[PDB]
Design an enzyme around this catalytic site. Structure first.
Site, PDB file in Angstrom:
ATOM      1  N   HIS A  96     -49.096 -34.564 -19.990  1.00  0.00           N
ATOM      2  CA  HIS A  96     -50.154 -34.442 -20.968  1.00  0.00           C
ATOM      3  C   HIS A  96     -51.019 -35.728 -20.943  1.00  0.00           C
ATOM      4  O   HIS A  96     -50.466 -36.827 -20.959  1.00  0.00           O
ATOM      5  CB  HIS A  96     -49.510 -34.204 -22.350  1.00  0.00           C
ATOM      6  CG  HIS A  96     -50.479 -33.860 -23.430  1.00  0.00           C
ATOM      7  ND1 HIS A  96     -51.210 -32.689 -23.431  1.00  0.00           N
ATOM      8  CD2 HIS A  96     -50.834 -34.521 -24.557  1.00  0.00           C
ATOM      9  CE1 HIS A  96     -51.982 -32.655 -24.500  1.00  0.00           C
ATOM     10  NE2 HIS A  96     -51.771 -33.755 -25.205  1.00  0.00           N
ATOM     11  N   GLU A 104     -46.515 -30.903 -18.902  1.00  0.00           N
ATOM     12  CA  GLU A 104     -47.021 -31.287 -20.234  1.00  0.00           C
ATOM     13  C   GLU A 104     -46.042 -32.127 -21.066  1.00  0.00           C
ATOM     14  O   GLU A 104     -46.370 -33.242 -21.492  1.00  0.00           O
ATOM     15  CB  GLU A 104     -47.414 -30.034 -21.034  1.00  0.00           C
ATOM     16  CG  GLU A 104     -48.705 -29.341 -20.586  1.00  0.00           C
ATOM     17  CD  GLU A 104     -49.972 -30.095 -20.994  1.00  0.00           C
ATOM     18  OE1 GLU A 104     -49.878 -31.097 -21.724  1.00  0.00           O
ATOM     19  OE2 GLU A 104     -51.077 -29.678 -20.593  1.00  0.00           O
ATOM     20  N   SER A 129     -56.178 -31.782 -25.864  1.00  0.00           N
ATOM     21  CA  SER A 129     -55.173 -31.847 -26.926  1.00  0.00           C
ATOM     22  C   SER A 129     -55.771 -31.464 -28.271  1.00  0.00           C
ATOM     23  O   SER A 129     -56.202 -30.331 -28.450  1.00  0.00           O
ATOM     24  CB  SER A 129     -54.551 -33.235 -27.001  1.00  0.00           C
ATOM     25  OG  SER A 129     -53.346 -33.190 -27.745  1.00  0.00           O
TER      26      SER A 129
END
Length: 566
Positions: free
Chosen positions: A467, A347, A214
């Site tokens: 994610h 995600e 990230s």
């Protein structure tokens, strides 16, 4: 976060401390650093492995008082032996579990781990840069435990860096020496430290891999883009992010004043008077108020954070981002080292929590004008060309007559991750020596083993690979537990850490000594490829065409009449 996850987390915090004392040994050891001697300690893992642990190694002067918002300076060397048997504090930030502010301005440290201080050969060095939108995160082992990686013969290093306003305040006035990107400048100097000192821990200074997830992926990418780090490392891994994601930079020069005003500043909008107020404010007051800096329009245009990496307004000695990321890719030294990138199979599933609070967001998909790339869209998002571009996005994700939360979350996968990756690959191809880039897709779903981010995304009992779901298979955390060696979760740990250490070693992620990979032909992406191929990692490893590719090309078509901005 709920009152139940608060008491639950409080308990796991109390457990992790007892387990950490329990897993400590008496075997202290001393290592050389160019700043002086450091004392580490050997520790245990729930899998009965063991590693040398050096925590709280300073790589910069504490950025306090007059150094606040300033580039980092080298730390002061010591005589004697510095104690590195405990963790230092994290950067000042909002605790996502409690909502209280925690951390300290004294936060510029790194940790070093390895199963062997005196290897018979120099080892690959892996540097992990944590994510957290540049506003949260830490290198504490209750979140990023080295326990899985030290089964391998590598040297693993987890760095901290300044977060939020303290990390990324930016002021136009060239006299005040607050260009911005301070927290990125911390990362640079940590890289320089790792370069000059990893040898003392059995690491190979000529074989260094930087990776992050990230915001840590965007960070890693920045480290590959800036001139400041040329030649420092040799492999890069971009996990669910990069520097041209729309959330990875922002022009925040005007937001300093706003922040001052929220913190009770009285006076005019000039940088100097603004800075003087921010310079004497309690650190936890500035951080606590950061949530309120963004205007309603900015939130509308999908600006995610008030302070973050920025194009610095003037060049100084330690400048990191002198031009927009897209421009920096055109000359970046890091284009010419081996690179792996990837994303998870769902995600945007991360945004479940946000949708739970704002169901009105789902109606943004009726025209999708709010997700049109900001550089292409008009201010009010009302121009007929913007509605046109919006419609292309709409066709890509709205499956029915009305958009759903799933359509929304699927769009987010692309807005925030897949589309930036595509633009980066294509831009890189026109500016690269030809070093390989490999793609993976993380597609392994499990509820039997999890990490703390799942508490924040409210991912409890939610199918699909969100994610941050992959972090669980790289690092130990205080919600983890010993898994049977035959379990799918354990195999995935072996595979993931296996592939990362293999890439780190050779610049090639394939190894037949990793179980599941006997039929794998992992080819890198070529400029002539219309369709990206990726290793899809689930219960079985399989090379496939990226399933997101059609929607990816759909987004690219928004740039049909503006090819220069792609």
């Amino acid at each position: 976060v709920s009152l139940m996850e608060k008491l639950k987390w409080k308990i796991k915090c109390i457990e992790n401390k007892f387990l950490n004392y329990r897993l400590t040994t008496n075997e202290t050891v001393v290592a050389e650093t160019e700043y002086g001697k450091v004392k580490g300690v050997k520790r245990l893992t729930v899998y009965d492995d063991s590693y040398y642990s050096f925590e709280g190694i300073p790589y910069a002067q504490p950025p306090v008082g007059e150094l606040r918002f300033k580039a980092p300076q080298r730390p002061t060397p010591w005589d004697g032996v510095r104690d590195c048997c405990n963790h230092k504090d994290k950067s000042v930030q909002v605790d996502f579990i409690t909502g209280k502010v925690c951390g300290s301005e004294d936060c510029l440290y790194l940790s070093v781990y390895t199963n062997n201080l005196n290897p018979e050969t120099k080892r690959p060095v892996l540097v992990y840069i944590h994510g957290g939108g540049f506003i949260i995160g830490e290198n504490h082992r209750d979140m990023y435990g080295p326990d899985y990686f030290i089964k391998k013969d590598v040297v693993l290093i987890n760095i901290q860096y300044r977060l939020g306003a303290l990390g990324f305040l930016s002021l136009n006035s060239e006299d005040l020496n607050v260009p911005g990107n301070a927290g990125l400048k911390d990362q640079v100097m940590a890289l320089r430290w790792i370069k000059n000192n990893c040898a003392n821990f059995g690491g190979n200074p000529d074989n260094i891999t930087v990776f992050g997830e990230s915001a840590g992926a965007a960070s890693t990418h920045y480290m590959m883009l800036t001139e400041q780090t040329r030649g420092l490392f040799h492999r890069g891994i971009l996990m669910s992010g990069n520097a041209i994601c729309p959330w990875a930079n922002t022009q925040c020069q005007h937001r300093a004043f706003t922040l001052a005003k929220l913190a009770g500043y009285k006076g005019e909008d000039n940088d100097k008077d603004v800075l003087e107020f921010l310079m004497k404010a309690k650190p936890q007051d500035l951080i606590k108020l950061e949530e309120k800096v963004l205007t309603l329009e900015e939130r509308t245009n999908k600006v995610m954070f008030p302070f973050g990496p920025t194009v610095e307004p003037y060049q100084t000695a330690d400048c990191v981002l002198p031009k927009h990321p897209r421009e920096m890719v055109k000359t970046a030294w890091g284009n010419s080292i081996p690179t792996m990138m990837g994303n998870t199979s769902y995600e945007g599933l991360f945004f479940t929590s946000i949708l739970k609070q704002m169901p009105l967001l789902v109606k943004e998909l009726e025209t999708c004008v709010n997700f049109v790339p900001s550089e292409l869209a008009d201010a009010e998002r009302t121009a007929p060309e913007t509605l046109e571009m919006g419609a292309k996005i709409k066709k890509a994700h709205v499956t029915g007559e009305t958009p759903t939360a799933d359509n929304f979350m699927d769009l987010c996968s692309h807005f925030y991750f897949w589309f930036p990756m595509h633009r980066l690959l294509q831009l890189r191809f026109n500016h690269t020596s030809g070093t390989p880039v490999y793609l993976y897709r993380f597609d392994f779903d499990s509820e039997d083993l999890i990490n703390p981010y799942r508490i924040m995304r409210s991912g409890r009992g939610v199918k699909g690979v969100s994610h941050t779901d992959e972090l669980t298979y790289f690092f130990w955390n205080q919600l983890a537990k010993r898994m049977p060696k035959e379990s799918r979760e354990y195999k995935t740990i072996e595979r993931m850490t296996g592939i990362w250490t293999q890439f780190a070693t050779t610049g090639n992620p394939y190894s037949n000594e990793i179980e599941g990979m006997e039929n794998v032909s992992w080819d890198p992406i070529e400029k002539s490829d219309e369709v990206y191929k990726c290793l899809n990692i689930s219960d079985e490893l399989k090379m496939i065409d990226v399933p997101e590719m059609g929607k990816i090309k759909q987004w690219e078509s928004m740039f049909e009449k503006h090819r220069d901005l792609f």
